[model samples]
Target: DCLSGRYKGPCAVWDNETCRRVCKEEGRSSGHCSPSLKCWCEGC
Candidate 1:
């Protein structure tokens, strides 16, 4: 996908909600925070 962003600015919580939100906005249907706590997205 061409859409992307990072949550390092606000220090996101170790949760999936934040990641999911960003991923969804990126046009991805699913997402989660991986080992690096980055919003890793999955299949739509």
Candidate 2:
């Protein structure tokens, strides 16, 4: 099963790959940016 996962800031964060960095910092093994520029936060 997948975890609740974690995200940071707003959609603006997705502009830079820093969004992924935020995810990792939150303890998520992986995450991706949504097409709408949303931080689709997730965990491995």
Candidate 3:
């Protein structure tokens, strides 16, 4: 399943590493940056 959410604060630039870092920091399993610059964290 996909856990979806937007980046908070001044994190406008979307990157896979950034997204994964934020996701792991936020207690998610993993994450990725979408084409639309959305952050999607997933947990399985």
Candidate 4:
């Protein structure tokens, strides 16, 4: 997982290919995690 620095922007997190595939079905993309991903912490 990557941090978004101090910009409060989005972060790209590494994920399993299988999981990413499933997520893509829900409109999610692999190797492209965002702050909205459920475990994102603000100002972290």
Candidate 5:
């Protein structure tokens, strides 16, 4: 199982790389940005 959550950042541009960066910084195992332009982070 994995734990997942949204990515909350202040930057105007949002992408998978950026989302992953913030997720790693926030101690998540990994992350990605959805097609809807929302950021999601996951931990396993």
Candidate 6:
């Protein structure tokens, strides 16, 4: 689910798997999903 500046605030928090799906679906960068290996939030 894209943030679009709404829902969960200015950014959206998601799990690594979900983030990967989002990136693949939206064709956007998988920010905050590398190295740390935990949930992260990012701007839509």
Error of 6 at 1 (Å): 18
Better of 3 and 5 by TM-score: 5
The models' CA-based lDDT, in order, is: 0.58, 0.55, 0.63, 0.36, 0.60, 0.42
lDDT of 5 by residue, 1-44 (tens): 12234455442354677767767877886666666556667664
Q: Rank the candidates by lDDT, best first.
A: 3, 5, 1, 2, 6, 4
Candidate no. 4 TM-score: 0.29
Structural similarity to truth (TM-score) of each candidate: 0.52, 0.53, 0.57, 0.29, 0.59, 0.33
Deviation in Å, model 2, residue 13 alpha carbon: 10
The lDDT, on a scale of 0 to 1, for candidate 3 is 0.63
How close to the true structure is residue 40 of candidate 6, measured as C-alpha lDDT? 37
RMSD of each: 3.7, 3.8, 3.4, 11.1, 4.1, 7.1
Q: Give the TM-score of candidate 3.
A: 0.57
Alpha-carbon deviation at 13 in model 3, angstroms: 8.7
Q: lDDT for model 2, on a 0 to 1 scale? A: 0.55
Task: For residues 1-42, write the lDDT of model 3, one tens digit per residue.
Answer: 354454543224546777687788777887766666667776
Local error of candidate 4 at 39, Å? 11
Model 4 lDDT tens row, 1-44? 43222223333364333334534444433333455642222222
RMSD (CA, angstroms), candidate 3: 3.4
Model 5 clash pairs are none
Error of 3 at 12 (Å): 9.0
Flag the better candidate by TM-score, 4 or 6: 6
- Model 5: residues with Cα > 4 Å off, grouped in runs: 1-14
lDDT of 1 by residue, 1-44 (tens): 32236544222465678767777867787666666545566654
lDDT of 6 by residue, 1-44 (tens): 24312112222344555655555555555534535444233444
Q: In candidate 6, which residue pairs clash?
A: none
